[PDB]
Amino acid sequence: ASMGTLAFDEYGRPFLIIKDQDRKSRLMGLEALKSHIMAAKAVANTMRTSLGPNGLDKMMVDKDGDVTVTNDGATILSMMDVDHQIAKLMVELSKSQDDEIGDGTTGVVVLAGALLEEAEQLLDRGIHPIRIADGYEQAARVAIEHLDKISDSVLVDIKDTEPLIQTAKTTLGSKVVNSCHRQMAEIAVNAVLTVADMERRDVDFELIKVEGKVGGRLEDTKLIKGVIVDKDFSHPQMPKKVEDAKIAILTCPFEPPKPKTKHKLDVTSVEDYKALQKYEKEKFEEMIQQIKETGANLAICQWGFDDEANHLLLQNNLPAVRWVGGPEIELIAIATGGRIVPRFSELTAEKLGFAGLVQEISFGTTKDKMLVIEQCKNSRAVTIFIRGGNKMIIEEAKRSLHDALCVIRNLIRDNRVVYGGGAAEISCALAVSQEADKCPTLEQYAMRAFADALEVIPMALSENSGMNPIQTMTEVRARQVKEMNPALGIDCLHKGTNDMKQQHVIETLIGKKQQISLATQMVRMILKIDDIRKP
């Protein structure tokens, strides 16, 4: 059964088929399915304790000893050192959910684990796994249709961001930033709305710069309608604050020009030496005067510059910053409304950007100075600057803000929402149960197992909140059946009501649909595997 077949022929002669077959292993048939289901169940049971507002973080340690405290399921599974192939499949499923949506990366694993757990007892009763997968697909289609039916639309206008703020708050509730919950939701919504193609098009995350610095407080996190820079003015004696700055963005170092081609300049006499010296001095003077001619009050370069340029810039009341990175150069050009000029000769006034305030920021007793550009006219780029008491909560806040931004992006793509708190899963389970009654007997078991697996999310929410899972879930399901209300969920926060509309627990329809679809496809793929041939 294991390691394969070892016969050495019926005549005594050697029987070698596969290289190193004595060192290889093989799992054949149903026991492979049982092992895979068991591994997926272990992964899902590990993940399920980090689901909901009362979920608890996992505290990951990498191979170098670096410590990460997080609730993001995708991050946890990415940093988890697994060897089992099905565990790797679960990690890939979480990463897929993160890539497509950005939220609900923990629900997919729990749902897949519940589906495979039900499939285990379905297999024990003598049902072909392909039949289980087909029934799961049918029930998933039914659940997707039911979600589309019970979905609700919200306004995505910039003049009323209340539904967007509520959705971002629902996303951020489970994270550690629930202390600054409303501020975090507000800044995420404003960041997404400021940089977005209004015609329901994509939201380019390249224009949302997220930077975190230690010190201060978590409440000090703010949205800057400009660019924050991890640089400072080159000369220590230039002013630290520039107002109504006319910005000149340059990608040419303030140095004498040199050809790219292999070049040699020959000095054959003293006159040649004098000419070269005068040429260098006049080149420096000319570049500085050309910069000054446009009327700019500030210069930003990318490739640094030497001492003479520094002193000439200081002497002409031209604050400047050097060695600004390429992405930061692009962000500054976008935000300030200015163009990028490759050489001084092409620098004109119309290519100058504008910023209402350019300042240098100190950070206590740390010697570190970081430049800020803000108060732009119609800046299309924004920056989220995160402060905290230690690096770890800063990273957690970074990924939580990323989750919120992704959720608001999903709302941008599609404005249909479904109320969370387990109400959507309960309603889908009810719909699947009702559809299974009309279905012929053979697929009824698979559809009922799918409904039971769907009902694990409210059970996990009740478990994390201390309530009795089965009793609370049964009561909520009975209430949903009695009165026509698919918005009744698990009162995780003990607010005193089960209706999620008043509690304003809102989830994107796209997120739930992606969760169900991805879980069903991964469960089918795992169910179809019947052999393992590890070395």
């Binding site: 080159s234 640094g304 510059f305 030497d306 001492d307 050097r322 060695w323 990175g325 390429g326 992405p327």
Partner: protein, 130 residues
């Protein structure tokens, strides 16, 4: 690793003068202009010396220990890259600061200058920091 003998065993070919005091070594490399020598040690500091005067111009510490040093030839002051840490760092000695970094033993600077190899135990474009 390569240490030439002591007496130079020659007949005054105006090259027997070598300094080579070795007051710091794992990445000793002569610069474009020969007036400066760049060396690194296991203390995580990069030391720049002027060979003529013979004293440390300025030391560079931004890392753990540093191993590999490569220099982009421009006055020997423009840039030099260190990849000792898993953090490729570029320094400018007209200001003495790490101008840019890449968190990713045999780093090699590309002849073009827009990128540099980071062979460890990738072509990182300096114009895009990726």
């Amino acid at each position: 690793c390569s240490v030439y003998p002591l007496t130079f065993d020659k007949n005054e070919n105006m090259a027997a003068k070598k300094k080579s005091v070795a007051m710091h070594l794992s990445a000793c490399s002569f610069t474009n202009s020969d007036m400066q020598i760049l060396t690194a040690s296991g203390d995580g500091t990069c030391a720049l010396w002027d060979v003529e005067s013979g004293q440390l111009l300025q030391s560079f510490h931004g890392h753990a220990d540093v191993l590999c040093l490569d220099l982009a030839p421009s006055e020997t002051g423009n840039t030099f890259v260190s990849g000792g840490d898993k953090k490729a760092m570029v320094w400018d000695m007209r200001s003495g600061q790490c101008v840019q970094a890449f968190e990713t033993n045999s780093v090699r600077y590309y002849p073009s200058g827009d990128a540099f190899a980071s062979g460890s135990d990738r072509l990182y474009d300096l114009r895009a920091d990726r």
